[PDB]
Design a protein around this ligand. Sequence first.
Ligand SMILES: NCCCCCc1nc2ccccc2[nH]1
Ligand SMILES: NCCCCCc1nc2ccccc2[nH]1
Lengths: 281, 281
Amino acid sequence: KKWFSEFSIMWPGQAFSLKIKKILYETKSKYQNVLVFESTTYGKVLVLDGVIQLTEKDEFAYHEMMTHVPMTVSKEPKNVLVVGGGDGGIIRELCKYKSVENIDICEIDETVIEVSKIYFKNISCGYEDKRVNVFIEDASKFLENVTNTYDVIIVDSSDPIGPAETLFNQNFYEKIYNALKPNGYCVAQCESLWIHVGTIKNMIGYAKKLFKKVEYANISIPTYPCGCIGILCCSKTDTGLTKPNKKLESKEFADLKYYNYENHSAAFKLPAFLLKEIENI
Amino acid sequence: KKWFSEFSIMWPGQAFSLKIKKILYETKSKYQNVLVFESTTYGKVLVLDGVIQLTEKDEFAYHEMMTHVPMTVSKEPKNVLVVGGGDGGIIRELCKYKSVENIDICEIDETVIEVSKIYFKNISCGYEDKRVNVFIEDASKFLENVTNTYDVIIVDSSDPIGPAETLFNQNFYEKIYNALKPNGYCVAQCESLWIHVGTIKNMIGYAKKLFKKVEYANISIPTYPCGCIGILCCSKTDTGLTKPNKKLESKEFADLKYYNYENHSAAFKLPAFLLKEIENI
Ligand SMILES: NCCCCCc1nc2ccccc2[nH]1
Ligand SMILES: NCCCCCc1nc2ccccc2[nH]1
């Protein structure tokens, strides 16, 4: 049996590998290389341009946190945008909120969505929900053209090497700002504090031009590089995203496996060296 | 340039690798294989029986948390035992406390200590401190024979495959209990919540026979398997180890890179699925 190994110039000198039980699908889409495999111990795995995007065993950590942080703080969110996220995980977590009326997703590569619907049915199950609308389209263009404004935007982007390159700059954060309601919130994937501190500092600077509160949270997830990944958290209000305004107590949330009320706030208590790096931004 | 790869039956189906800048020392001691290398990006690395024990880049996370959790809760700790920990990292963090009068360490393999003194000088620097006493000896035997009792015991053990096999059972926890002062505390390395939940549950059960409060905390550290490792936290008192009784404000603590007052408590807020697993223990 072979192993899959994840190498990258974004994490030089380190690699993470999973043993392959069997290869399920590979293709070269118009935008990237797509690989899907059953691992021996982490279930099925999705790989894009040789970087792991999710595994069945741990995906709930990243999807629950990315979704329920902003959604428990937004009072009455009605319209939510997901940028990237073709796998559907964020959407699955959003659909649990009865109050949400519309969910839009903007994903440039429809092959990601289709592969997720076929091979990852417990992740892509939200696509059946009537409130969900799909747009196959560059996120920049989508944000420039959309007429609606949103209560929450969740940027579930890949890394800056690839089609997600455009989602890590100042202009983008402007468009997000203009696309949010006046009390609206954006959370975005924002890399590992163990290795990408330069990026984290840049993203925070970009966000601080526009938003009045920019905060950063960390998630433990073994199949992203260095075992964690953070959330850049942007608020148009004094008060920010560190404290939930509700508890997820109805039956649709009984199955949550990571998120809870306490660990929402705990995710924002960061290692001392990171506080120091981002103190005078 | 070659890569080092960390395989194990304790984490089947996954491996983590670091690129080797150069090999510095290898030997077979009486107890295990010892390898030391300079990595391209994580500095120097110590390997025991093919498992990473520390790297210079991230060791502060595990050593600060393991030490300052119990030491900020113990009111006036005078005598502290470290079990295992031949590298010296815990000792380095202990020496920062002016109030401590004695530090004993019990490590079975003196080659670990000696290699750390030669190759890892910013880790093994506490061995120069006059309060430090070294015992080359099985921990079980040491605990059976010691006459003194301790304010804090820190069990910085390797994994259960190896000489640290004896440190993961009921009898051991008895001896620790008998070796502590009546208000004393023990913290112990207790594995990754992402993969070793059976072990975490067993260790907690063992501890709960004896101690009136057993709690579990998590540390983010990229070079241990799954990117995190936990602390089993044992208290003879109602009150436990989740809340510090002091702040580390004197000049000897200004250099801390992970631990702070807030993230002490935050480390005990665990993922929902782990709470559920250990609820009826
Ligand atoms: N190296 C960290 C990678 C994090 C990726 C998170 C993620 N997973 C995705 C799946 C489909 C589309 C966009 C995505 N963004
Ligand atoms: N797979 C997790 C390994 C954790 C090891 C922590 C550790 N590092 C050590 C260095 C010297 C002696 C005992 C040690 N215990």
